[PDB]
Amino acid sequence: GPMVHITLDPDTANPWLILSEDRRQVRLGDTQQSIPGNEERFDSYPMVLGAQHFHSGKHYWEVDVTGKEAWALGVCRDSVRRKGHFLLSSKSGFWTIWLWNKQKYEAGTYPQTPLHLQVPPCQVGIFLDYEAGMVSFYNITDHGSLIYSFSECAFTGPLRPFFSPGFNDGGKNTAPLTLCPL
Numbered sequence: 001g002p003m004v005h006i007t008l009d010p011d012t013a014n015p016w017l018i019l020s021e022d023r024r025q026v027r028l029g030d031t032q033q034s035i036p037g038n039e040e041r042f043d044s045y046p047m048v049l050g051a052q053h054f055h056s057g058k059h060y061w062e063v064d065v066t067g068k069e070a071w072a073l074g075v076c077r078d079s080v081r082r083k084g085h086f087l088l089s090s091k092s093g094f095w096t097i098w099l100w101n102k103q104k105y106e107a108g109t110y111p112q113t114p115l116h117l118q119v120p121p122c123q124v125g126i127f128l129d130y131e132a133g134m135v136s137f138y139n140i141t142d143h144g145s146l147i148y149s150f151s152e153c154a155f156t157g158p159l160r161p162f163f164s165p166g167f168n169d170g171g172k173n174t175a176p177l178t179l180c181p182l
């Protein structure tokens, strides 16, 4: 079925991230880790990919975001740029939504789309339909209501799950993103 056990890919993880031993949780650290500058690693924001690659088909996973003031979630092309600054944009191979400033939910269209959520999500579901060209986000706290769906996505090659537990801010947003057991 579509549900997939996601694990995080340590080789992609920005040095400001701390991954759990089981690679099912990620949080912001208070200082940068000393780790390699390999080509796969995101170097400018606290971002990490799932290890799994999606070439086709339907895939679903859930993430716990309880109480965090910021986070970003979704899917991206494996071929996205890893080094440097960029726009988390569905014009650049990212299909993402995010929260920042405790209450500002946005979809990563270009320009960005403000999202009005009646029930702040504590868990988010991400449904990828490769052949349908869609990435859809569901509010598990609100009986699975639709947060946002990207459609007409140009998918070529493998996609990857995408995560950020926040940006660097001073160490306030310290709780992890946790991949829910399915």
Ligand SMILES: C[C@@H](O)c1ccc2c(c1)N(CCCN(C)C)c1ccccc1S2
Pocket: 045, 046, 070, 071, 072, 086, 087, 088, 089, 098, 099, 100, 164, 165, 166, 167
């Ligand atoms: C504009 C778009 O390209 C972009 C790129 C990288 C990131 C974000 C947005 N934001 C939202 C803006 C935050 N900023 C004002 C300090 C994030 C939200 C949650 C976790 C990480 C991030 S990093």
